[PDB]
Design a protein around this ligand. Structure first.
Ligand SMILES: COc1cc2c(cc1OCCCN1CCCC1)N=C(C1CCCCC1)CN=C2NC1CCN(C(C)C)CC1
Ligand SMILES: COc1cc2c(cc1OCCCN1CCCC1)N=C(C1CCCCC1)CN=C2NC1CCN(C(C)C)CC1
Ligand SMILES: COc1cc2c(cc1OCCCN1CCCC1)N=C(C1CCCCC1)CN=C2NC1CCN(C(C)C)CC1
Ligand SMILES: COc1cc2c(cc1OCCCN1CCCC1)N=C(C1CCCCC1)CN=C2NC1CCN(C(C)C)CC1
Ligand SMILES: Nc1ncnc2c1ncn2[C@@H]1O[C@H](CSCC[C@H](N)C(=O)O)[C@@H](O)[C@H]1O
Ligand SMILES: Nc1ncnc2c1ncn2[C@@H]1O[C@H](CSCC[C@H](N)C(=O)O)[C@@H](O)[C@H]1O
Ligand SMILES: [Zn+2]
Ligand SMILES: [Zn+2]
Ligand SMILES: [Zn+2]
Ligand SMILES: [Zn+2]
Ligand SMILES: [Zn+2]
Ligand SMILES: [Zn+2]
Ligand SMILES: [Zn+2]
Ligand SMILES: [Zn+2]
Lengths: 261, 258
């Protein structure tokens, strides 16, 4: 029998509830963390929030023309009229996405705004058979759809080096020497439960919205294909994770093209 | 009469805020940037450490006296409709600590009003004697959250060197700060002074509890009828300065500055 152990792990902080079910064992809904819907900090992170440092567009339309400055910063605006990535979007090597911000002349409903509108897909936390907790979609998700953001505690590399648990870190790539990461161990959203898959249906993309401090991109997961209702979400953890954890366990994603077992 | 803007906020508020001018030929104001939340130019080291937040451990709707956030606010002053209780001291308002993301309660608990944003149907309009003003297009019951005074967070040192001081809101306290809505602000930058105000500003804390930076929320002091202009008491610092230049045009029989 499938036990509903939570009607909403986000307790109303998302646009829709995220229930938790367990049809496997007697484990209750996870509670060793604090759910937050947006990134937080403990030690200060001096994000550049000077409004005059934002690059912005002066579009007089819905930011669907070639002249949009924010589209140019993203090479081009990759969103279609429904907010989904165009098929030309390179998911093997995603570019930086600069969404429109509060300094732009455009309206809040312009085309170049997707991730800033929050989680919309109906997801469900559930107990897997051999990978702990996982996240599944309760609905069909078309390809190129924004699913969720990897939310957690913004910490420096120096802080990440003294944390005992490293299984919930997401490294923030930046050309500058200073490096940071998102730790979802103590504070995080639904994305902290997404398991690794070697042929993933999700791809992380670095996105900038209210600020453009390149040290702190926000991590948005987009669907790489049609995700059918009931299917578990997964993304590629990368080589750093498996270089560390491979000596502890092999990958259990079950793909015929598994690269870590 | 003459609609000069369908929405001065460009969709950043829950409701459009149109602008009309039935008085003269002035177009919609455009010498500023509309922002729906406070911004900064020079950095402000607001304490955003999540472990520094006081929070409640309520298992209900935060309607009991055990709610930590209510105790910080002396008590929770919101009724089930989100309006201030009749016991609220409009003459000397307390600090309001709304529930935050560190609390164990849900996003729809009783102690959350200002963080839900502007809801009332407002309208920017041209007055006959004091430039632009804001009016309500609907009846607003007493104790209702109307709007927040939004703008650029600046220090006292910065405020003392700004040529235009007509859009400052002082955040009183050693180090003191203020909100300058001259270059960046929301609809509240157009609210005029009235000696019989129907709005009262209240200092509110939500996502952070850095007492240097309270957010300014306007609540109705009485039933505001549809079509009535919004107004609050600018205070004596404003009128000690600007009284040398002009007199108050609020038109009240109890006007104190004309
Ligand atoms: C100098 O001071 C400011 C500098 C900037 C401002 C505003 C400023 O205030 C001026 C105050 C003057 N007072 C006017 C009345 C009395 C005094 N505008 C912003 C944003 C504009 C859009 C809305 C959000 C703010 C961007 N950054 C800024 N300079 C860049 C703008 C774009 N150029 C070009 C290369 C394209 C690069 C430098
Ligand atoms: C095990 O998987 C990772 C492990 C580490 C990572 C990243 C990892 O997976 C990222 C992808 C998987 N995610 C899973 C959920 C979401 C994606 N990050 C780094 C740097 C962090 C800061 C930014 C630059 C890279 C540090 N080293 C790590 N663990 C060490 C921490 C300190 N301990 C002891 C010294 C106490 C030794 C191991
Ligand atoms: C009114 O009394 C309750 C009202 C609600 C409760 C519990 C309640 O009991 C309190 C008394 C209990 N007795 C006291 C003695 C013994 C038990 N529960 C919550 C949560 C439900 C999910 C699990 C955590 C608590 C949400 N719904 C509630 N109404 C809200 C709906 C939204 N409004 C706003 C729009 C203003 C805020 C009130
Ligand atoms: C004119 O009305 C005010 C004038 C001033 C205020 C506040 C005021 O109105 C507040 C209420 C009215 N609002 C209107 C919209 C919303 C409420 N605040 C202060 C301090 C700011 C923060 C630290 C403590 C107080 C600075 N001095 C002030 N003007 C000077 C600035 C520097 N210039 C230079 C030329 C030298 C000389 C005049
Ligand atoms: N493909 C995979 N194969 C084996 N274990 C995996 C896996 N993907 C994720 N995991 C497990 O999940 C951790 C990532 S955190 C992901 C959520 C986790 N399943 C939970 O219940 O909290 C990894 O450290 C590993 O222990
Ligand atoms: N009660 C009042 N009497 C006369 N002028 C007033 C007033 N209340 C506000 N004002 C004018 O408005 C300024 C405050 S900013 C308020 C908006 C302003 N009416 C505008 O059109 O931009 C004051 O400096 C004063 O010039
Ligand atoms: Zn644009
Ligand atoms: Zn833009
Ligand atoms: Zn735009
Ligand atoms: Zn695998
Ligand atoms: Zn509470
Ligand atoms: Zn609460
Ligand atoms: Zn609380
Ligand atoms: Zn008056």
């Amino acid at each position: 029998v499938e036990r509903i152990v939570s009607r909403d792990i986000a307790r109303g902080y998302e646009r829709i509830p995220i229930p938790c079910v367990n049809a496997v064992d007697s484990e209750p809904c996870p509670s060793n963390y604090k759910y937050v819907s947006q990134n937080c900090v403990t030690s200060p992170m001096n994000i550049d929030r000077n409004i005059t440092h934002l690059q912005y567009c002066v579009c007089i339309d819905d930011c669907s023309s070639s002249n949009c400055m924010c589209g140019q910063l993203s090479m081009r605006c990759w969103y279609d009229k429904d907010g989904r990535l165009l098929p030309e979007f390179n998911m093997a090597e995603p570019p930086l996405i600069f969404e429109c911000n509060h300094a732009c002349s455009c309206w809040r409903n312009c085309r170049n705004r997707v991730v800033q509108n929050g989680l919309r897909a109906r997801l469900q936390l559930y107990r897997t058979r051999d990978m702990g907790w996982g996240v599944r979609s309760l609905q069909d998700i078309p390809p190129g759809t924004f699913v969720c953001e990897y939310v957690g505690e913004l910490i420096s590399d120096s802080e990440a080096d003294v944390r005992e648990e490293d299984s919930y870190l997401f490294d923030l790539d930046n050309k500058d020497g200073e490096v940071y990461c998102i730790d979802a161990r103590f504070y995080g959203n639904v994305s902290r439960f997404i398991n690794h898959h070697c042929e993933p249906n999700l791809v992380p993309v670095r996105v900038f919205m209210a600020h453009q401090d390149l040290r702190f991109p926000r991590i948005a997961f987009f669907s790489t294909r049609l995700i059918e209702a009931g299917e578990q979400l997964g993304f590629d953890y990368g080589e750093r994770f498996w270089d560390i954890k491979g000596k502890l366990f092999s990958c259990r994603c079950g793909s015929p093209k598994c690269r870590h077992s």
